[PDB]
Structures are given as C-alpha cells and as structure tokens.
Design a protein around this ligand. Sequence first.
Ligand SMILES: [Zn+2]
Lengths: 64, 62
Amino acid sequence: GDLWTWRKYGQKDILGSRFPRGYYRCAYKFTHGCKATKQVQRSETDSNMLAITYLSEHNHPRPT
Amino acid sequence: GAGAALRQEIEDKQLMVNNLTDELQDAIDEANPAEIANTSQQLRHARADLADLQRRFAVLRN
Ligand SMILES: [Zn+2]
C-alpha cells in the first residue's frame, strides 16, 4: 500500500533487471517544504513482489 | 514568478543528481566497477539535463 501523493523525479537502470528503480518525492515538497522521498523497485522474475525504500517522514498529514 | 516550475524541475533534477552521486560514491566504497560504470554513465545524462534547465533559467533572468 501507500496513502501519500508522489511526483516521480527520476529512474535508474539497475544491473540484472529490465525494471528501472523509480525515484519519487512528496507532491507537497514545494507547497509545504516536505523532505519525504521513496524508491520503488519491481522484479521481472518475482511477479507479485514490490520493494520500496522510504527516506524521511512527511511534514504534513496524508490528504483526502 | 511564472517560470517557477523551471525552479522546481531544476531541484528535482539536482535531487536525482545527488542520489546518483551518493550511489556512485557508495559503488566506489564497495569497489564495484560494474556499478561505477552504470551509475557514472547515468549521472552524466542527469547532470546534462540539469545543465540544460539552468541555461533555460539564465535566459528568463535576461
Ligand atoms: Zn509529504
């Protein structure tokens, strides 16, 4: 799951994967000064697995 | 300012450049020449993108 709003600022070609890592920053980065980011990795092999790395908590509640 | 999205885009790119730099230095610490090649190559592209967005800004200043 994930209850926050994000904007993808970049992706990296990983070695031994056709699935690039997504680099996401909070939609509120600019409006609210939010520092929060997350990195998202899917696996072409393992179908259902999803690997996310969250860096920094949000400086606001999650929105409706 | 009108071209304030250009200010945003720039910082988003500068952020990716910082991640790619972190990883490149992590890869140098780990002595992983394959990951050095991968990250350094993609860091050139990211930094050129950054350079291009900054040229666009300097234009508006003028
Ligand atoms: Zn946030």
